[PDB]
Design a protein around this ligand. Structure first.
Ligand SMILES: CC(=O)N[C@@H]1[C@@H](O[C@@H]2OC(C(=O)O)=C[C@H](O)[C@H]2O)[C@@H](O)[C@@H](CO)O[C@H]1O
Ligand SMILES: CC(=O)N[C@@H]1[C@@H](O[C@@H]2OC(C(=O)O)=C[C@H](O)[C@H]2O)[C@@H](O)[C@@H](CO)O[C@H]1O
Ligand SMILES: [Mg+2]
Length: 966
């Protein structure tokens, strides 16, 4: 509080705050006959004093202060987001009052004399009032009077007031409560309830009290986002610093409590220095509720009873302070948005302290409070199964807090009903295929957030939904098998595409900080141990493999001997992120494309700036372990040269995303992704097409990039490669990896190269091995550059410059101005001796493989080592082949002739959906040559050939073993 008016054009963003820690603190205040104004030093929000206002009814005191009340425009411009100016104060009732406080504003007001609003005084403890001065009254510019009037209808009474504040606030966040009406209401939770209801029995009550216990077990013997403190001497010291003293005739004095979001109303950074020093003595709810939960764990584990007793008292005094501060049902506190961040550990803390809260007679207030403030999550907490109920953030940060609030219901019949309903909710939520790009599991094992497959949001969702099914296992509240089967598809799928980090292609907006399966390991145990036929061996063997445990350790954990899982082998299609995984020995290759329904990349204001090529027909080879150890180093990484990728080599100023905030660039057609055969073999098909006019994106840049994966190798081909600039700087990257003392060695045609720098160029018949033991034989190219060199780059968050030394090799496509092509072959078990034999076999008429067609319509790769053929129909076509004659849709087809059966697989990686519409199954006619008979694939012999009817749903390949008709 300065003599400068509120919302001074001169300093619009500077809050004016009546807090009474200044001199002649009531100078700006006048009362009438029938009101007295004192300071009490006994309760306070800011400073250590508050306005004790004693009043006959009808009485009034005026606050003399000039207000240059802006428009919603002026204030929005001053700050930078939709804004309003807000009138806001705290008041305490020691005893409720049956009637309304009037706040009126005008010019040179007295007792007897524009617009104002009402506060219902029927409550005790602190409440917070918060109005937009443009939208919540019933305004001029020349206002100097704010007059508080006690109700006519009450005869006398007494109100403490503090922190009367004019300030610029976010216009989403002045909320209606049981005291004040605003334009804004966050409606209270209305629990769905499923039929038939479970009855209160001793059985059903024992399950509830067990679920509570299994929950307490999980938080008393490490959680992400929990600032765990086991040291009692620290909890004690922290609690002391709060200065909470019980007051004689009810409630507390202590340091004022505020959420991370509540502090906005103050506009802290613009606060006069008097006001910022007082704002600094506030406590952040998040730290407070973290200390409560840390205390509740300490109490549940403490053996010494004197100290166990001291812990209970601490927790109870902190609960009382919390409710006296006006964190109770019907108190909005102006707002509480992002309540999860400030309170997630309060929810859980009530589980550990259920009994103490019962004795202290606080269980009913504390449930009422958490239930009010939970109205924010109404669309999950209400527990009606919708299209949005499969949200992966809720499974991470909200699911256990939700169950904890349910378990705190006083009435036994209501508790069972809520937990019964919450089981049917969770089941639906992990069972349903959400429409479009809505969050949640999908039929192929993918798991969507931000409208796409997203390991970085699914991995923590997988851990906590696994733990949820385990808390309810073998009870009448146990989750449906459908939800258990589906979470398992997803988590087996994550074991397949991790090794143990997900690839760079699946790093989302966080390249080089891939999520690890290591942080989701407990989930493999929870899910194994919660199977209808427990334990599930598959999931158990994954748990042992991921958590680094021996067959010997398994019997204690799972109660029978299970061999830790050996790394998945073969090929798995995952067209929900237009990708596939090839696994051989300890290596995983992430093949990634994109399309209408799969963004190439997530790029935000400060994430993945150089991400443009994340999904450009990439094929990152990762051996089991740390990717950084294998030289996937961000420092000096050449963002143009993602392994496998056909790109234009831009400078970083131009590779940087054109949109300064958010771009998630979707493809130009439905068709790109992978398909599998016999679970051993894959083909990628990627049609590279750029937008017709997006800044920094060459509209004429194109490629058809196909890959056929079998056993220890992959055949890579390219056709119809074009740019606006005759393929100037158009490269296909074979590999890129850091040089270290451990990753020191490149091989070229039998020769070790350890030199730094080093450049050379290669052509057809040449070969290399990188420091990770991947060999590249070049089978059709004019010009393959090799480089060992100091590279300069920039990190994907704040584009700050980096550098390091890299080994790299790429095809230079600028030697073919129109329709540039390539072929190369990757060996994953490579050595100088075996690559020399592979090269000899290549020179013997290519006994490695034959390309039977390579154009804008079809690629066809026959792999002669595997005796498998892959067919990438970029367009429907009739072809000439031993096996496949005609496909009437863009598709990926595969053949393997084995002794006297022909196995055909088919799919469209096209998901056949939009961001809103739900996927429907595309029907693919594959005619094949000659007569066959034999799986949900249909076959009809028509003339001297055979029509196959593959049903492609969410790009899940189907196949059929045929045998030949005489
Ligand atoms: C605000 C922004 O940049 N993006 C929005 C998304 O929010 C991000 O992701 C999440 C999350 O919980 O999933 C939290 C953080 O607020 C932010 O990093 C998200 O709402 C998304 C939905 O597709 O779209 C953006 O508006
Ligand atoms: C995709 C994403 O941003 N997920 C969020 C978390 O980030 C991941 O986890 C961590 C970490 O080690 O804490 C670092 C990286 O940011 C990323 O792999 C994290 O912000 C979390 C906090 O609640 O929310 C996740 O969804
Ligand atoms: Mg004060």
């Amino acid at each position: 509080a300065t003599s400068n008016p509120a919302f001074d054009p001169k300093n619009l963003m500077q809050s004016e705050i009546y807090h009474f820690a200044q001199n002649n603190p009531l100078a700006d205040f006048s009362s009438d006959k029938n009101s007295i104004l004192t300071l009490s030093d006994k309760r306070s929000i800011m400073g250590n004093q508050s306005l004790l206002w004693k009043w006959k009814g009808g009485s009034s005191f005026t606050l003399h202060k000039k207000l240059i009340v802006p428009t919603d425009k002026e204030a929005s411009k001053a700050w930078g987001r939709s804004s309003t100016p807000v009138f806001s104060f705290w008041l305490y009732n020691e005893k409720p009052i049956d009637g309304y406080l009037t706040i009126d504003f005008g010019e040179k007001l007295i007792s007897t004399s524009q617009a104002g609003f009402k506060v219902k005084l029927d409550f005790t403890g602190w409440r917070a009032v918060g109005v937009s001065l443009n939208n919540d009254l019933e305004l001029g510019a020349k206002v100097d009077s704010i007059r508080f009037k006690a109700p006519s209808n009450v005869s006398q009474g007494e109100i403490y007031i503090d922190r009367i504040m004019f300030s610029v606030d976010d216009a989403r966040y002045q909320w209606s409560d049981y005291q004040v009406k605003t334009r804004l209401s966050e409606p209270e939770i209305q629990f769905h309830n499923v039929k038939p209801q479970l009855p209160v029995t001793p059985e059903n009550l024992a399950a509830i009290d067990l679920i509570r216990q299994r929950l307490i077990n999980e938080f008393v013997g490490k959680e992400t986002n929990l600032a765990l403190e086991e040291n009692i001497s620290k909890l004690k010291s922290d609690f002391d610093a709060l200065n909470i003293h019980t007051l004689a005739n009810g409630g507390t004095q202590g340091r004022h409590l505020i959420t991370d979001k509540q502090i906005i109303i103050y506009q802290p950074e613009n606060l006069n220095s008097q006001d910022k020093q007082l704002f600094d003595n506030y406590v952040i709810l998040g730290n407070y509720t973290t200390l409560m939960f840390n205390i509740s764990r300490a109490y549940v584990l403490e053996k010494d009873p004197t100290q166990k007793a001291q812990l209970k008292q601490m927790y109870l005094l902190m609960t009382k302070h919390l409710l006296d501060q006006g964190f109770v049902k019907g108190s909005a506190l102006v707002t509480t948005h992002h309540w999860g961040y400030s309170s997630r550990w309060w929810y859980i803390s009530t589980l550990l302290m259920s009994d103490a809260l019962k004795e202290a007679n606080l269980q009913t207030q504390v449930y009422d409070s958490l239930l009010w403030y939970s109205r924010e999550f109404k669309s999950s907490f209400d527990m009606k199964v919708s299209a949005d109920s499969s949200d992966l953030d809720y499974f991470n940060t909200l699911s256990r807090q939700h169950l904890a609030l349910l378990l705190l219901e006083p009435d036994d019949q209501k508790r069972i009903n809520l937990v019964n309903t919450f089981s049917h909710y969770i089941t639906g939520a992990l069972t349903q295929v959400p429409p479009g790009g809505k969050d949640g599991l999908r039929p192929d094992g993918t798991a969507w957030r931000h409208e796409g497959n997203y390991p970085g949001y699914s991995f923590p969702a997988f851990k906590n939904a696994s733990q949820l099914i385990y808390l309810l296992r073998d009870t009448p509240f146990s989750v449906g098998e459908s939800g258990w089967n589906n979470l398992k598809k997803a988590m087996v799928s994550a074991w397949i595409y991790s090794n143990p980090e997900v690839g760079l292609p699946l790093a989302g907006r966080h390249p080089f900080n891939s999520p690890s399966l290591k942080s989701v390991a407990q989930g493999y145990y929870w899910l194994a141990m919660s199977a209808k036929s427990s334990p599930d061996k598959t999931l158990a063997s994954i748990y042992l493999a991921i958590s680094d445990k021996t067959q010997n350790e398994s019997t204690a954990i799972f109660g029978e001997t299970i061999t830790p899982a050996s790394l998945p082998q073969g090929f798995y299609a995952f067209n929900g992120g237009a990708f596939g995984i090839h696994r051989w020995q300890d290596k995983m290759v992430t093949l990634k494309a994109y399309n209408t329904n799969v963004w190439s990349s997530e790029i935000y204001n400060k994430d993945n700036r150089y991400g443009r090529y994340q999904s450009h027909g990439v094929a990152q080879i990762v051996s089991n372990g740390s990717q950084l150890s294998q030289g996937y180093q961000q420092e000096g990484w050449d963002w143009n040269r993602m392994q496998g990728a056909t790109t234009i080599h831009l400078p970083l100023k131009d590779l940087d995303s054109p949109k300064p905030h958010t771009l998630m660039q979707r493809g130009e057609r439905g068709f790109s992704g992978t398909s599998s055969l016999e679970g051993q073999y894959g083909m990628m098909a990627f049609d590279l097409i750029y937008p017709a006019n997006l800044e920094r994106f060459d509209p004429n840049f194109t490629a058809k990039k196909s890959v056929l994966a079998a056993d220890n190798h992959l055949i890579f081909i390219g056709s119809n490669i074009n740019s606006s600039d005759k393929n100037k700087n158009v490269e296909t990257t074979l590999f890129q990896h850091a040089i270290t003392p451990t990753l020191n060695t490149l091989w070229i045609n039998g020769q070790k190269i350890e030199n730094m720098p080093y450049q050379t160029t290669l052509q057809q018949g040449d070969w290399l091995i990188d420091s990770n033991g991947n060999g590249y034989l070049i089978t059709q190219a004019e010009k393959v550059n090799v480089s060992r060199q100091h590279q300069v780059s920039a990190e994907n968050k704040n584009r700050q410059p980096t550098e390091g030394n890299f080994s790299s090799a790429w095809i230079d496509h600028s030697t073919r101005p129109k329709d540039a092509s390539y072929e190369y072959m990757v060996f994953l078990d490579a050595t100088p001796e075996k690559m020399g034999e592979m090269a000899q076999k290549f020179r013997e008429n290519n006994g490695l493989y034959q390309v039977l067609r390579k154009d804008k319509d079809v690629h066809i790769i026959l792999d002669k080592l595997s005796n498998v053929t892959g067919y990438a129909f970029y367009q429907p076509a009739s072809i000439e082949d031993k096996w496949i004659k005609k496909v009437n849709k863009p598709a990926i087809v595969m053949t393997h002739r084995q002794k006297d059966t022909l196995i055909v697989s088919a799919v469209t990686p096209d998901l056949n959906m939009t961001r809103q519409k739900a996927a429907t199954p595309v029907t693919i006619n594959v005619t094949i040559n000659g007569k066959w008979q034999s799986s949900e694939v249909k076959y009809q012999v028509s003339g001297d050939n055979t029509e196959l009817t593959f049903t492609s749903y969410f790009g899940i390949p189907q196949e059929i073993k045929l045998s030949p008709l005489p």
